[PDB]
Design a protein around this ligand. Structure first.
Ligand SMILES: O=c1ccn([C@@H]2O[C@H](COP(=O)(O)NP(=O)(O)OP(=O)(O)O)[C@@H](O)[C@H]2O)c(=O)[nH]1
Ligand SMILES: CC(=O)N[C@H]1[C@@H](OP(=O)(O)O)O[C@H](CO)[C@@H](O)[C@@H]1O[C@H](C)C(=O)O
Ligand SMILES: [Mg+2]
Ligand SMILES: [Mg+2]
Length: 224
């Protein structure tokens, strides 16, 4: 299947790093953050990637080009207005086609094996969930067997990893413009159409300098 990497975020919490460098292109261990995803995706057998962008977008295209150096074919979905995650995915659907695709929040650094998702999967969406960051119980969702439901307090909830397989039909109808992805996932969940899994390996949402350091720390433990 195809993959989409979300890369339209402005990274305001990463400043001043993101003043002249798009977040996707910030180096983590001598390598641009998004290039971990491109290499992982190519290793996992993915050959076609869609990347949306907004903030400093043309720098992303300039740097990655057509993706041939990664053994990929990349298409870009430029966004001129703030579309958010859901609206942005929707805007890119023409490039993705009608088949389920792998969706990867580009801000993430992880050792999750993307090739696990090319196995028989369940529903309109299949979500990779991880331990709640910061040692809290808030999270987003709960996982019962393979079935994902909406979170409830802090007894045993999990956090959405930003790694998933989505069915384009998830966006069936859908307000053409700017909207959120989570709300759509809960309608699917409400209909028993969302499966999931709990990944217990390394995962960092790289949204701050502190998260960047943590990712570097873990990446340095893997090299050894
Ligand atoms: O409108 C958007 C916003 C976010 N995103 C995607 O989700 C990622 C960031 O998610 P984010 O919600 O934290 N936005 P951000 O401005 O980066 O917060 P901050 O770092 O504090 O400035 C971005 O890199 C994209 O991958 C989009 O694709 N579109
Ligand atoms: C689409 C997506 O990846 N959402 C996740 C991403 O959002 P981000 O923090 O990058 O803005 O990382 C968070 C954990 O750090 C999750 O809670 C987000 O999922 C929540 C439920 C959401 O859909 O808004
Ligand atoms: Mg942003
Ligand atoms: Mg982030």
């Amino acid at each position: 299947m195809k993959a989409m990497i979300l890369a339209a975020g402005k990274g305001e919490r990463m400043r001043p790093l993101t003043l002249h460098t798009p977040k996707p292109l910030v180096p983590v261990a001598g390598q641009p953050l998004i290039e971990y995803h491109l290499r992982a995706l190519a290793a996992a057998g993915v050959t076609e990637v869609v990347i949306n962008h907004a903030w400093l977008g043309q720098q992303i295209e300039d740097h990655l080009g057509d993706g041939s150096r990664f053994g990929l074919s990349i298409r870009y979905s430029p966004e001129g207005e703030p579309l958010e995650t859901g609206g942005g995915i929707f805007k890119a659907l023409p490039l993705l086609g009608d088949a389920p695709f792998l969706l990867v929040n580009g801000d993430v650094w992880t050792d999750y094996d993307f090739a696990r998702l090319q196995a028989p999967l369940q529903g309109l969406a299949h979500l990779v969930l991880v331990d709640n960051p910061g040692h809290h119980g808030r999270g987003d969702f709960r996982l019962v067997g393979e079935q994902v439901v909406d979170g409830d307090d802090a007894p045993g909830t999990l956090t959405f990893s930003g790694i998933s397989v989505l069915h384009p039909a998830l966006f069936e109808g859908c307000q053409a413009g700017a909207f959120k992805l989570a709300p759509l996932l809960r309608q699917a969940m409400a209909a028993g159409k969302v499966s999931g899994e709990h990944y217990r390996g390394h995962w960092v949402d790289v949204g701050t300098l502190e998260r960047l350091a943590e990712a570097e720390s873990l990446i340095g433990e893997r090299a050894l």
